[PDB]
Amino acid sequence: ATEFTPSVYSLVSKPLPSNSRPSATLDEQAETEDLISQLFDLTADPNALVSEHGKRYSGLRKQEHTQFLASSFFQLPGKFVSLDASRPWLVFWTVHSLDLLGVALDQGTKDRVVSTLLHFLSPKGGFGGGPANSQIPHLLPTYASVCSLAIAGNDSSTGGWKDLAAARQSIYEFFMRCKRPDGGFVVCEGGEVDVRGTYCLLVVATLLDIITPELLHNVDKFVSACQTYEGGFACASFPFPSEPSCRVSMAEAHGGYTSCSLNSHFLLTSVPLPSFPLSIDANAALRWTVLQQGEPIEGGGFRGRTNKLVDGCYSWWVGGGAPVAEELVRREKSRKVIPPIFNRVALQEFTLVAAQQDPGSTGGLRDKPGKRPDQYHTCNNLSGLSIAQHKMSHSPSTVSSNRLKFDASKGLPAVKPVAPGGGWKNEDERQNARREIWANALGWIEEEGGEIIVGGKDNRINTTTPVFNILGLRLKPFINYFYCQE
Amino acid sequence: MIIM
Amino acid sequence: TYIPMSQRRSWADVKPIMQDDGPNPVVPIMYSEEYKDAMDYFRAIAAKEEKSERALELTEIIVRMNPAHYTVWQYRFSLLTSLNKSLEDELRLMNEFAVQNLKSYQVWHHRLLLLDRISPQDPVSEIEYIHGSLLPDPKNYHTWAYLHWLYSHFSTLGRISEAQWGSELDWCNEMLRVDGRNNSAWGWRWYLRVSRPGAETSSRSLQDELIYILKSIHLIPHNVSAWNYLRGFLKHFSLPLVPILPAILPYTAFGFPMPSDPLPEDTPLPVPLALEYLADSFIEQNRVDDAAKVFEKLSSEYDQMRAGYWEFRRRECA
Ligand SMILES: CC(C)=CCC/C(C)=C/CC/C(C)=C/CONC(=O)CP(=O)(O)O
Ligand SMILES: O=S(=O)(O)C[C@H](O)CNC1CCCCC1
Ligand SMILES: O=S(=O)(O)C[C@H](O)CNC1CCCCC1
Ligand SMILES: O=S(=O)(O)C[C@H](O)CNC1CCCCC1
Ligand SMILES: [Zn+2]
Numbered sequence: 001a002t003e004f005t006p007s008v009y010s011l012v013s014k015p016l017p018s019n020s021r022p023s024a025t026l027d028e029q030a031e032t033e034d035l036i037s038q039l040f041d042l043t044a045d046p047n048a049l050v051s052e053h054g055k056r057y058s059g060l061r062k063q064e065h066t067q068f069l070a071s072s073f074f075q076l077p078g079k080f081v082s083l084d085a086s087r088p089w090l091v092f093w094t095v096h097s098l099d100l101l102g103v104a105l106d107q108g109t110k111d112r113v114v115s116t117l118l119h120f121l122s123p124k125g126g127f128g129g130g131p132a133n134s135q136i137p138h139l140l141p142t143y144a145s146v147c148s149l150a151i152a153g154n155d156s157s158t159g160g161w162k163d164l165a166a167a168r169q170s171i172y173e174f175f176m177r178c179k180r181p182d183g184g185f186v187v188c189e190g191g192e193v194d195v196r197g198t199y200c201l202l203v204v205a206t207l208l209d210i211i212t213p214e215l216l217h218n219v220d221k222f223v224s225a226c227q228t229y230e231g232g233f234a235c236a237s238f239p240f241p242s243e244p245s246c247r248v249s250m251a252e253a254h255g256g257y258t259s260c261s262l263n264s265h266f267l268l269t270s271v272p273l274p275s276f277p278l279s280i281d282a283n284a285a286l287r288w289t290v291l292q293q294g295e296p297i298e299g300g301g302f303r304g305r306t307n308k309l310v311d312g313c314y315s316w317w318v319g320g321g322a323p324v325a326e327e328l329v330r331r332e333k334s335r336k337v338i339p340p341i342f343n344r345v346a347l348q349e350f351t352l353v354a355a356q357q358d359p360g361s362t363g364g365l366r367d368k369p370g371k372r373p374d375q376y377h378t379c380n381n382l383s384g385l386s387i388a389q390h391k392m393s394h395s396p397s398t399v400s401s402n403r404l405k406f407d408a409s410k411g412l413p414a415v416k417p418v419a420p421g422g423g424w425k426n427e428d429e430r431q432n433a434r435r436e437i438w439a440n441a442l443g444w445i446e447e448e449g450g451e452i453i454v455g456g457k458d459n460r461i462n463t464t465t466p467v468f469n470i471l472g473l474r475l476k477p478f479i480n481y482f483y484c485q486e
Numbered sequence: 487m488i489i490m
Numbered sequence: 491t492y493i494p495m496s497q498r499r500s501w502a503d504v505k506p507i508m509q510d511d512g513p514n515p516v517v518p519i520m521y522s523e524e525y526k527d528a529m530d531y532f533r534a535i536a537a538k539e540e541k542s543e544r545a546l547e548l549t550e551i552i553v554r555m556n557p558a559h560y561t562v563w564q565y566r567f568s569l570l571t572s573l574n575k576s577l578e579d580e581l582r583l584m585n586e587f588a589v590q591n592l593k594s595y596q597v598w599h600h601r602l603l604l605l606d607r608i609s610p611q612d613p614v615s616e617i618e619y620i621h622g623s624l625l626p627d628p629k630n631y632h633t634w635a636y637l638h639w640l641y642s643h644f645s646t647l648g649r650i651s652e653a654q655w656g657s658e659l660d661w662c663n664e665m666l667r668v669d670g671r672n673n674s675a676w677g678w679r680w681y682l683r684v685s686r687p688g689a690e691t692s693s694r695s696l697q698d699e700l701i702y703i704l705k706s707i708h709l710i711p712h713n714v715s716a717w718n719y720l721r722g723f724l725k726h727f728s729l730p731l732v733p734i735l736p737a738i739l740p741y742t743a744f745g746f747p748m749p750s751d752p753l754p755e756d757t758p759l760p761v762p763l764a765l766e767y768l769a770d771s772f773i774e775q776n777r778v779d780d781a782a783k784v785f786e787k788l789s790s791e792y793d794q795m796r797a798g799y800w801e802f803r804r805r806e807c808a
Binding site for chain 1: 507509510511512513514515516517518519520521522525529532533537555556557558559560561564567568595598599602603628629631634635638639642643646668669670671672673674677680681684685686687709710711712713714715718719721722723725726754755756757758789794795796797798799801802805
Binding site: 083085086089093129138140141187196256374375376377 | 487489
C-alpha cells in the first residue's frame with residue numbers, strides 16, 4: 001500500500017534551491033525548512049519497529065489533545081473576544097475533533113451544545129456567530145452550527161434536529177436573501193461574496209433538503225470561474241456585464257478556497273438540472289492539489305498556495321480536497337471512453353511529528369513548529385490526518401444502492417420558493433432531485449484494505465467524510481432525519 | 487483562526 | 491479607570507440588553523468589562539434600530555475591541571449611509587485600522603463598500619494606497635483580492651485609463667523584480683496581461699509575454715510560480731509546447747530567451763517541472779512511451795513526494 005507513499009525519513013531532505021537569487025520568500029522558506037527538519041531529526045521515525053532511544057516519540061497524543069479541547073470548551077479567556085463572532089466554529093472544531101479522537105460527550109454536555117447553538121438561530125432564518133439577540137445570521141456559522149448539531153444532537157425533543165427541521169423554510173429564505181444574480185452569495189446582509197459562503201450554503205441546503213432551481217441558478221458558473229491558471233481556485237469570480245459577458249477569478253489559487261470550490265462543485269454534480277453544473281478543469285485541480293504537498297525537508301505537509309509555507313490546517317483544505325478532485329478526474333476519464341494520489345504516509349508523518357504540540361504541555365495541534373496550537377488547527381490537522389489514514393472514494397455502486405433504497409414518499413414539506421416559478425417543475429422532478437442529492441451525499445466510502453496507519457494502530461482516528469467533514473456515522477442519521485429515510 |  | 495455606560499449621561503435613556511446565551515452555554519468567552527458593556531448597549535441600540543451618532547461611536551468602540559464582529563460592521567455601514575456621513579473620513583479611519591493592526595474579512599469588505607458607494611471618478615489614490623499597504627505583507631490575500639475587485643469594478647464603469655493600466659503593469663513588474671517568488675504578483679500579472687477583458691491579444695503581446703515568462707524561468711529555474719504561469723499561458727492560448735522545448739531541455743538533464751550558458755549556481759538538475767514539461771511535450775507528439783518514461787523517473791527518482799501522482803500519469807500513457 002506504500003510503494004508510492006515514501007516515508008519522509010526514507011527520502012533525501014534538501015533545501016529548496018536558491019538559483020543564486022535570494023528573496024524574502026526564500027528566506028522564510030529556508031527558515032521553515034530548518035525548523036521542521038530539525039524537529040523531524042529529534043523525533044523517532046514513526047515507521048520504526050522499536051522506538052529509538054533519546055528521540056521523541058511521535059505517537060498521537062490523543063489524551064493531551066482531548067484535554068486541550070476540554071479546557072477551552074467550557075471557558076475561554078478574554079483574548080478569544082476576537083473569535084466572539086466565530087463561536088459556532090469553536091463548537092464545531094471541538095466536537096468534530098472529539099468525534100475524530102473517538103471521545104464521547106455525555107448527554108448533558110451534548111444538550112448544552114444543542115442549547116447553545118439553538119440560541120444562535122434567528123427566527124427569520126440562519127445561525128449567527130453568537131446569540132440571535134446579538135448577531136445577525138451568517139452562512140459560515142450556519143454551516144458550523146448545522147454540522148455541530150449533526151455531531152451533538154439527536155431526533156428527540158431536546159436534540160435540536162426538530163428545531164432545524166422547523167427552520168427549513170426560514171433558512172432557505174435567508175439563503176435566497178443572500179443570493180446574487182451572478183451566482184455568488186453574500187455571507188450575511190451586506191457581507192462579502194466568495195466560495196466559502198457557497199460551500200457553507202450548499203452543504204446546509206443539501207443536508208436539510210432545501211435545494212431548488214432558483215437557489216442554484218448561476219452558482220455553478222460563479223464557482224467554475226474561480227479556477228485560476230494554476231488549477232486551484234480563488235475566493236471569487238467577477239462578473240463583467242454584457243447575463244455577464246465573462247467572469248474572471250479575483251486572486252490566487254488557495255487551498256481554503258480550492259477546498260470550498262471543489263466541494264461546492266461536487267455537491268452540484270448531484271443536482272439534476274440541464275447542462276448543470278458548468279464543468280471545471282478537474283485535471284488541473286488535481287495537479288494543483290498534489291503540487292502543494294511539501295518536500296521531505298518540510299515534513300510532507302501541505303502549503304496553501306505556491307511559494308508559501310506548509311501549514312497543518314491544509315491537511316484538511318488541500319488533502320481533503322484530493323478525493324474530490326480524484327473522483328472528478330475519474331468521471332471525466334469515464335466520459336472520454338490504483339496508486340494513492342498524494343503521499344498519504346508523509347502527511348501523517350507531518351501530523352504526528354510536526355503538527356502536534358510538544359509532549360507534556362497544553363496539547364493541541366498547530367500550523368507548524370513555533371506556532372501555538374488552537375482549536376482550528378486541531379480540527380483541521382485531525383481531519384486531514386483522517387483523509388490520509390483512510391482511503392476515501394465516492395462509490396457509484398454505493399450511490400446506486402442508495403438510489404435503490406430511497407423512499408421518495410417520505411419527506412418534510414417542500415420549500416416554498418421566493419419566486420413563483422423558482423421551484424422544481426413537478427413532483428417527479430423534485431423527488432428525482434431529492435433522490436440524487438441524498439444518494440450522492442451518502443456515496444463516500446472508506447475502501448476496504450486501503451487503511452494506512454503510520455506509527456501503528458493506536459494512531460488511528462475515525463473516518464471523516466470528504467466534502468462535509470463530519471463522520472459518516474453522524475452524516476447518515478442526520479441527513480436521513482431531514483429526508484425522512486430509515 | 488481567522489476563517490471568517 | 492473605566493466609567494460604565496449606565497453612568498454616562500449620553501446613554502442614561504438606554505436600557506441595556508443582556509446577551510441571550512441560554513442557561514449554561516458552551517465555548518463561553520470571559521469578556522472584558524468594556525466589551526460586555528458595549529455589547530449590552532449595542533444590543534439595545536440595534537433592537538430599537540437607532541441610527542445616531544452615539545450608535546456610530548459605539549460601533550467604532552466595539553470593532554476596535556473585535557475587528558471581526560461582522561454584525562457591528564454591518565450596523566456601522568448602515569449608520570454611515572443613514573446619517574449621510576463623510577465616507578472619505580471613514581476611509582481615513584480605515585487607513586488607521588489596518589495601521590493599528592486591526593484587520594479582517596470585515597475591515598476589507600467595509601473598505602470595498604466605501605469605495606463602491608463613494609464611486610470616485612478616478613480611483614488612483616485608492617490604488618496607490620493598496621500598493622503601499624502591501625509593503626508589510628506583499629502576499630496578503632485579502633489585499634490582492636481587493637485590488638482585483640477595485641480594477642474590475644472601476645473598469646466596468648469605464649474609469650481605468652490606458653495610462654492607469656500601464657502604470658499598474660509597471661508596478662507589478664517591480665513587485666516581481668523585488669521577489670520573483672511572489673505568486674500573488676504573478677497572479678496579478680495574469681489579470682493585467684491575460685484575463686482582464688481589456689487585455690490585448692496580438693502576435694506582439696503573446697511574443698512579449700513568452701519572453702517575460704522564459705526570462706523569469708532562466709532567472710530562477712526552480713521557481714514554481716514561473717513554471718505554472720508558463721503552463722497556464724500555453725494552455726490558455728492553445729500554444730504547442732514543442733517549439734519552446736529548446737529553452738526548457740537544459741533543465742531536464744530559436745529566437746526566444748535561453749538559459750544562461752553557465753547555469754546559475756545552486757541550480758540542481760533536473761528541475762522536476764521541466765521534466766513535467768518534457769513529458770507533456772512527448773504527449774503532444776503522441777510519443778506516449780517516451781512520456782511514460784519521464785513520468786516514471788519523476789515518480790521513482792526526481793519528485794518522489796509525488797510518486798503516486800506521477801505513477802498515475804505514467805499509467806495514463808497506456
Ligand atoms: C468553510 C470555510 C470557512 C473555509 C475557509 C478555508 C480557508 C482556510 C480559507 C482561506 C482564507 C484566507 C486566504 C486567508 C488569508 O490569510 N491567510 C494566509 O495568508 C495563510 P497562507 O500563507 O498559508 O496562504
Ligand atoms: O500522550 S497521551 O497519550 O495523550 C497522555 C499522556 O501520555 C499520559 N501519560 C501518563 C503518564 C503516567 C502514566 C499514565 C499515562
Ligand atoms: O426575528 S429575527 O430578525 O429573526 C432575530 C432578531 O431580529 C434579532 N436581531 C438582533 C438584534 C441585535 C443585533 C443582531 C440581530
Ligand atoms: O496494533 S499495532 O499497530 O500492531 C501496535 C500498537 O498500536 C502500538 N501502540 C503503541 C503501544 C505501546 C504504547 C504506545 C503506542
Ligand atoms: Zn493554518
